[PDB]
Design an enzyme around this catalytic site. Structure first.
Site, PDB file in Angstrom:
ATOM      1  N   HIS A  11      -6.585   3.060  -2.058  1.00  0.00           N
ATOM      2  CA  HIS A  11      -6.403   2.218  -0.884  1.00  0.00           C
ATOM      3  C   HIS A  11      -5.048   1.507  -0.954  1.00  0.00           C
ATOM      4  CE1 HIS A  11      -8.202  -1.731  -2.757  1.00  0.00           C
ATOM      5  NE2 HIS A  11      -7.518  -1.029  -3.644  1.00  0.00           N
ATOM      6  N   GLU A  22     -10.828  -3.365   5.177  1.00  0.00           N
ATOM      7  CA  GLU A  22     -11.116  -4.161   3.991  1.00  0.00           C
ATOM      8  C   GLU A  22     -12.102  -5.322   4.121  1.00  0.00           C
ATOM      9  OE1 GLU A  22     -10.389  -3.141   1.085  1.00  0.00           O
ATOM     10  OE2 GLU A  22      -8.635  -1.826   1.228  1.00  0.00           O
ATOM     11  N   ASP A  68       0.817  -1.211   0.000  1.00  0.00           N
ATOM     12  CA  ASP A  68       0.000   0.000   0.000  1.00  0.00           C
ATOM     13  C   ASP A  68       0.849   1.258   0.000  1.00  0.00           C
ATOM     14  OD1 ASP A  68      -1.996  -1.814   0.135  1.00  0.00           O
ATOM     15  OD2 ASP A  68      -2.813  -1.171   2.071  1.00  0.00           O
ATOM     16  N   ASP A  95      -6.981  -8.883   4.258  1.00  0.00           N
ATOM     17  CA  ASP A  95      -6.558  -9.712   3.133  1.00  0.00           C
ATOM     18  C   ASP A  95      -5.168 -10.276   3.373  1.00  0.00           C
ATOM     19  OD1 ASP A  95      -5.684  -7.050   0.752  1.00  0.00           O
ATOM     20  OD2 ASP A  95      -4.510  -7.976   2.353  1.00  0.00           O
TER      21      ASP A  95
END
Ligand SMILES: N[C@@H](CCCC[B-](O)(O)O)C(=O)O
Ligand SMILES: N[C@@H](CCCC[B-](O)(O)O)C(=O)O
Ligand SMILES: N[C@@H](CCCC[B-](O)(O)O)C(=O)O
Ligand SMILES: [Mn+2]
Ligand SMILES: [Mn+2]
Ligand SMILES: [Mn+2]
Ligand SMILES: [Mn+2]
Ligand SMILES: [Mn+2]
Ligand SMILES: [Mn+2]
Lengths: 310, 310, 310
Positions: A142, A276, A129, A233
C-alpha cells in the site's frame, strides 16, 4: 449525473486486518443515500468478496517476493478493480472507489487514466506511497502503488503485475499533505520533479493556495480531468484515529474538508478514491464514528455538498 | 558542522522539580543520534550534576532576596553555563543547550553574545520572561532572565549576578508566541520598544509572516547571527502538556515545527536553547513522550531536518 | 465607560435545561470584576427570575403553536429583555447580555437597534438561527430569532410577538462561522442576499479577512455602530463542549478570541450578547470551566483586553 460506487474491501497491501471493512462501514453511514441526495444516480459495484480475500490473505505467508508481501494476491485483486473502474468510466459513470488500503489505487488510477489519458492525479496523503519493489523496507504494497503506476524499478516488478498499463507520467501527479516520506522516496520525488506539497507548504501558504497549486500542476494543458486518491491518514490522527498509519501534525478536519470543496468547485473531478479507513483500529466507538463519518464527509464535499446555498 | 550539546539540568528558576530531568530525557529519545544523523559532529557538555544541584535546591529555602527565590543558586549555575557556552562558541562549535528551566538562558544568551556580539535573539515563549527583581511577584527567576540580561532595575539585582556581561540590547531581541505577559512586562516591552509578536499577530498574519518579521527585527545590519531560545510552553498544552507553565491558545504542533524550518532555512542560526521540558509533570506516559519527542523534533527541524528532499 | 450586564437566564428557546445557569456561572467566574478591571463602570440588570421561569417552562407543554414550542413564554421573556436593553441603551450604557439560549437575541437586537437604528449586527454562530415559524422542524425558537426580527413569514408569527419592532434589515446582518445551516435557511440567506461567512470562508481567507469583510458588510454608510450576538457553539466543541448544539469543524479558541480583539479594535461595538453556555451539559468539570471561562474570555477581549500593552 451517473455514479458507480466501487467496493474494494482489500487489506493485502498492509499488515492490519479491518481495513477491508471500510466499504461496508461507509455504506452503513449512508454513503449511497448521501450521493443520491446530492443528485447522483448511484449504482454499487462489488469487485470481490472481502471475506474470501481476507481468508486467503491471513493464511498464505508464502506469497512474497523479497521484502514485498502478497504481490500475487495484490496483483490479482487490483487488476479486478482496474477492470471494474475502467468499465465504470467507459460507461460514462463517475467511479467513487472506497477501500481498502491504498494499494487499490493501482487499479483505480490505471482504470481512470485508461479512459481519461490526460487526467491529472492529486494524491492526498501523509505518505508518498512511491517505494519501489527493491526499495521498500516494510514490503507493504500500500506504500508502493505510485512506483508501479509510474513503472519505476521495472526490472524488479513481478510478472503478476504485467497487467498494469503505463499511463501515468510524473508530471501528472501532485501530492498534498506529505509528512512521512522515506528517504528513498524523497530522492525519487526530487529526481522525477514530482509536484509535492508537504505540511510545510500548507503551513507556509495555507490550504487554499496549496490546492490551487496542486490543481494547476497537473492541469497545464489548460484544464484537464482531475482524479483524487484520498488517504484518510492525511488528516491529523486526532480527527482520523482509526487508520493504519497515523502521523501527527496533519490536516485539520476543516482543511481536510475545505480541500474537497475547492476541488469540487473546479468542476473537473472525474474520479475519487477514499482509502485506509480501518474501523477495527479504534480505541472507543468514538474513534470509529469519527473516522467513517469523515470518509463520508469527504465524499459529500467532493461530490458537491456545500455549507451555503448552491 | 561541529556541535556541542550543553546539558543544563537546572530547576532553580522555578518551584516544580522534574525539569532538571529534561536533558537526560531528551538524550534518551536520541537527541544526539538525530544531530549526528543530520551530519553534525556532536559532543556532549555536562556543566554540573543535576542530583547535587537538585539536592541543594530542595533544601535551602534561605536562598532568597525579597520575593526572588534562589538567586545565589541560580547565579552560580548560570555562570557555569555561561562559561561553558562561551567556550563552546569560541571553539567554533554550535551550542545546543537543553534545559532545565528558562533561567538557564541567562548563561546561554550571555555566552553566545559574548562571541557573536551582533547576534539577534528570538525568544519563542508564551511568556516575556522579563520581570525585574523588584517587579516579580512569584519571584521565580525563570521569568526574569531577560530583565537581568538587559540590565534592567540594575540597583536591585544581587551581587551574585555581577558576573553577567551587558551584551544584549532591546533592539536585538524578538518574541514569538506571547500570550501571558504580566502588566509590568507589557509596560517594559512598550517602553523599550521590544519587537514582540503575540498569538494575536500569529492569528492575524500567519506564522510564516511572523517568523519573517521576527528575523528581520533583529537582523537589520543586513544579515547577522541569530540565536533562538525555545520555551516549549509556547506550544499549546494539548501538544506540550508536560511543562511547568502551560497556557491555552498557543502554537499548534505544526506552527511550532514550521517556525524551526523557516529559521533553519535562513541559514544564520548560531545557537539554540530548548527549555522547560518537565517529564514529571505529565498525566499519562502519553503526555511525557509527546513533550520530550517535541523537544527533539524542534531540535531536528532547527538543525536542518526537512519533510522533503534537501 | 458605563456598562450594564443584562442577566437573561432563559432556556425556553430550546429543550435542554441548564442554559439558564449561564448568567450566574459567568458572574462566578468574575465577569463583572473583569469588566470593572477593564475600566468599565458596571451595573447588573436582572430581568426575571430564572427559577420561576424554569419552573413555568418545564411544566407547560401546552404552550405551542404548531411545531413551535413555548411561543407565549418566549414572547413574554424576550419582550422583558427588549425593554431592559432598550432602556440600558437609552441611558447611554453599553448593554452586555449574558444568556440563556439565543432566543434572547430577539430582545437584545430589538433593544439596541431601537436606540441605534443604523447599528450593524454580527451574528457569530455555527447556525443561521433564521428558521421561520412555519419552516422550523424542531420548533425550538432559539433557532428562529432572526426570522422574527426580519419579519419573515409575517402571517404565521403569533400575536404574542406583536411587540417586536421591525428595525433590522437583511443588509445590516452578517454571519461568521456558519456550518450547520438548514436547507430552508440556505435559501433564505441566498434570497435576501444576507452577508454570510461560513467556515469555508474562514478556511479560505483566514479569520482576519472574514472579520474585516463582516464589519464592512454592515458598515457601508462609512462607519456605523456595531453589535455582536455571540453564540458559543461557533467555537469547535473541543473548546466549547458544554453547549446545546455542538458542531465539529468550528472556530479554534484562538480565532474565537482573535475575532473579539479585531472587533474591539474597530472601536464601534455598541452591544454584545454571549449566549448558549449550558454548564449542565458537561462531561467533566473540565468541560464546564472551559466553556464558562471562554464566555468571560470573549467578554474581556470584546471589551478591550489585549495580549500586549494598550
Ligand atoms: N512509507 C511507509 C508507510 C506507507 C503507508 C501507505 B499509505 O499511505 O497508504 O498509508 C511504508 O512504505 O511502509
Ligand atoms: N510571568 C510568570 C511566569 C513566567 C514563566 C517562565 B517561563 O517562560 O520560562 O516558563 C512569572 O513571572 O512567574
Ligand atoms: N437549526 C437548528 C439548530 C438551531 C440552534 C440554535 B442556536 O444557534 O442558538 O444554537 C434548529 O432550528 O433546531
Ligand atoms: Mn496512502
Ligand atoms: Mn498514508
Ligand atoms: Mn520562558
Ligand atoms: Mn514560558
Ligand atoms: Mn445561535
Ligand atoms: Mn448555534
Amino acid at each position: 449525473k451517473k455514479m458507480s460506487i466501487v467496493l474494494a474491501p482489500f487489506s493485502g497491501g498492509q499488515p492490519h486486518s479491518g481495513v477491508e471493512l471500510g466499504p461496508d462501514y461507509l455504506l452503513k453511514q449512508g454513503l449511497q443515500q448521501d450521493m443520491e441526495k446530492l443528485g447522483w444516480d448511484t449504482r454499487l459495484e462489488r469487485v470481490f468478496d472481502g471475506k474470501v480475500v481476507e481468508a486467503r490473505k491471513a493464511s498464505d505467508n508464502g506469497d512474497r517476493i523479497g521484502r514485498v508481501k502478497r504481490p500475487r494476491l495484490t496483483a490479482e485483486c487490483t487488476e479486478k478493480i482496474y477492470k471494474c473502474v475502467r468499465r465504470v468510466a467507459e460507461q460514462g459513470r463517475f467511479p467513487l472507489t472506497i477501500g481498502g488500503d491504498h494499494s487499490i489505487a493501482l487499479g483505480t488510477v490505471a482504470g481512470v487514466l485508461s479512459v481519461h489519458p490526460d487526467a491529472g492525479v492529486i494524491w492526498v496523503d501523509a505518505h508518498a506511497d512511491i517505494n519501489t519493489m527493491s526499495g521498500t523496507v516494510s514490503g507493504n504494497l500500500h506504500g508502493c502503488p505510485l512506483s508501479i503506476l509510474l513503472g519505476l524499478d521495472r526490472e524488479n516488478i513481478p510478472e503478476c503485475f504485467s497487467w498494469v498499463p503505463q499511463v501515468l507520467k510524473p508530471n501528472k501527479i501532485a501530492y498534498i499533505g506529505l509528512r512521512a516520506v522515506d528517504d528513498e522516496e524523497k530522492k525519487i520525488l526530487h529526481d522525477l520533479n514530482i509536484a509535492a506539497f508537504s505540511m510545510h507548504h500548507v503551513d507556509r501558504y495555507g490550504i487554499d493556495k496549496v490546492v490551487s497549486m496542486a490543481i494547476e500542476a497537473v492541469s497545464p494543458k489548460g484544464t484537464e480531468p482531475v482524479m483524487v486518491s484520498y488517504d484518510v491518514d492525511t488528516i491529523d490522527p486526532l480527527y482520523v484515529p482509526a487508520t493504519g498509519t497515523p502521523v501527527r501534525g496533519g490536516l485539520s478536519f476543516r482543511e481536510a474538508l475545505f480541500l474537497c470543496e475547492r476541488i469540487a468547485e473546479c468542476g473537473r473531478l472525474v474520479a475519487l478514491d477514499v482509502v485506509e479507513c480501518n474501523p477495527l483500529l479504534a480505541a472507543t466507538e468514538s474513534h470509529v464514528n469519527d473516522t467513517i463519518s469523515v470518509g463520508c464527509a469527504i465524499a459529500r464535499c467532493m461530490m458537491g455538498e456545500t455549507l451555503l446555498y448552491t
